[PDB]
Amino acid sequence: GEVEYLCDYKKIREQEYYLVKWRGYPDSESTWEPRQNLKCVRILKQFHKDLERELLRRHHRS
């Protein structure tokens, strides 16, 4: 299975999950996958940096 891109992130409650858009599936077929299922470290880093910037934007608002 190859991750094309990550769509979202959640943590319940110790366990982290990622909404994964799979290569060869349409966008609406993305599925939630626990961190250990995934090998795509570059994509994870880019995803996290992107989200970090958005939370920082929000932190500054306050």
Author numbering: 43 to 104
Q: Which passages does the manuscript contain on this structure?
A:
However, it exists as a monomer in solution. The fold is composed of an N-terminal SH3-like β-barrel, followed by a long C-terminal helix α1(residues 82–100). The β-barrel consists of a sheet with three antiparalled strands β1 (residues 45–53), β2 (residues 58–64) and β3 (residues 73–76). Interestingly, the chromodomain of the human SUV39H1 we crystallized lacks the first aromatic residue F43 of the aromatic cage. Thus the two aromatic residues, W64 and Y67, in the loop between β2 and β3 form a partial aromatic cage, which is a conserved structural feature among chromodomain proteins and other Royal family members. This may implicate that the cage structural element is not essential for fold stability. We purified two SUV39H1 constructs including the one used for crystallization (aa 44–106) and the one containing a complete aromatic cage (aa 42–100). By means of fluorescence polarization assay, we found that the partial chromodomain does not show detectable binding to any histone H3K9 peptides.
